[PDB]
Amino acid sequence: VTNQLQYLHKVVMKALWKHQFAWPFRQPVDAVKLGLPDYHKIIKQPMDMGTIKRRLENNYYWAASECMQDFNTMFTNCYIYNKPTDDIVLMAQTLEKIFLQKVASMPQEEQE
Amino acid sequence: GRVTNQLQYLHKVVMKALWKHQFAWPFRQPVDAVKLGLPDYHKIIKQPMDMGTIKRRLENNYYWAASECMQDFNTMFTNCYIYNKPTDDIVLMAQTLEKIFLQKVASMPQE
Numbered sequence: 001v002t003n004q005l006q007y008l009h010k011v012v013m014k015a016l017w018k019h020q021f022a023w024p025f026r027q028p029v030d031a032v033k034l035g036l037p038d039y040h041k042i043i044k045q046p047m048d049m050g051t052i053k054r055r056l057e058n059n060y061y062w063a064a065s066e067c068m069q070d071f072n073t074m075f076t077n078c079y080i081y082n083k084p085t086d087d088i089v090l091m092a093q094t095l096e097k098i099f100l101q102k103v104a105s106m107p108q109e110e111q112e
Numbered sequence: 113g114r115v116t117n118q119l120q121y122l123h124k125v126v127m128k129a130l131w132k133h134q135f136a137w138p139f140r141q142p143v144d145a146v147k148l149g150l151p152d153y154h155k156i157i158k159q160p161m162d163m164g165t166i167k168r169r170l171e172n173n174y175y176w177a178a179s180e181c182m183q184d185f186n187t188m189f190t191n192c193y194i195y196n197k198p199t200d201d202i203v204l205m206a207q208t209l210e211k212i213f214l215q216k217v218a219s220m221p222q223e
C-alpha cells in the first residue's frame with residue numbers, strides 16, 4: 001500500500017466514483033444488456049471503475065502507474081468503440097479530465 | 113502563464129521522451145486534413161492538438177499549471193481515438209505513446 005496508491009484510492013477513485021456521470025463506468029460493459037454484439041470483438045481488454053476499485057481495495061496493484069493504466073484503458077476503450085457523437089464519449093471526457101487534474105497532484109515517489 | 117517545477121518536468125522529461133519515440137512522427141505537427149484526404153476531420157474533431165503545439169506552449173510559458181498541459185496531451189490522444197477506426201495503426205501508436213506519458217506523469221513532482 002504505497003503513498004501513490006493511497007492517493008489514487010482516497011482522492012482519485014473517490015472523486016470519480018461519486019460523479020454524476022460515473023454510473024455507466026461503475027461495472028463492466030454488458031454487451032448482451034446493451035445490444036452490442038461486436039463490443040468484445042473490438043475491445044480486447046475491458047475495464048471499469050468497479051474492477052479498479054476492487055483492485056485498490058484488495059492491494060492488487062504494485063505501482064500507481066499500473067492503476068493509472070487501468071483508468072486509461074477504461075477511457076480509451078470508450079473512445080475507440082463508440083461514435084464521436086455518443087453522449088458516453090462526453091461523459092468519459094468529463095471523468096478523464098478530473099482523473100488528470102487529480103493525478104497532477106499525486107505523490108511523486110512510490111514508497112511502500 | 114508561468115514557469116513551474118512540474119511544467120519544466122513535462123517539457124524536459126515527458127515531452128522530450130515522447131518526441132523522439134519511433135511512433136511520435138504523426139503527432140509532432142497538426143493533422144493536415146487536406147494533405148491526408150480527410151475532409152470530415154475538422155467536422156468531427158473540434159479541438160485539434162499535437163505535440164508541436166504543446167511544445168511551443170511550454171516554450172512560450174503559455175501554461176499556468178501542469179494540469180493544463182496534461183489536458184492538452186489528453187486531447188491529442190483522445191482526438192486520435194475518437195476520429196480513427198479501431199483497427200487503424202495510428203490508434204496503436206497513440207496508445208503506446210499515451211502509456212509512456214502516464215508512466216512519466218506518475219513520477220512528476222507532487223508540489
Ligand SMILES: Cc1noc(C)c1-c1ccc2c(Nc3ccccc3C(C)(C)C)c(C(=O)O)cnc2c1
Nearest residue numbers: 023024025028029030034036077078081082087088
Ligand atoms: C462506458 C462505456 N464504454 O462503452 C460503452 C458502450 C459504454 C456504455 C454505454 C452506455 C451504457 C448504458 N446506457 C447508456 C449510458 C449513457 C448514455 C446512453 C446509454 C444508452 C443509450 C445505451 C441507454 C448503461 C445503462 O443504461 O445501464 C450501462 N452501461 C453503459 C456503458
Ligand SMILES: Cc1noc(C)c1-c1ccc2c(Nc3ccccc3C(C)(C)C)c(C(=O)O)cnc2c1
Nearest residue numbers: 137138139142143144148150191192195196201202
Ligand atoms: C495523429 C493522428 N490523429 O488523427 C489522425 C487522422 C492522425 C494521423 C494519421 C496518419 C498520419 C500520417 N500518415 C500515416 C501515419 C500512420 C499510419 C498510416 C498513415 C497513412 C495511412 C495515412 C499513410 C501522416 C504522414 O504520413 O505524413 C501524418 N500525419 C498523420 C496523422
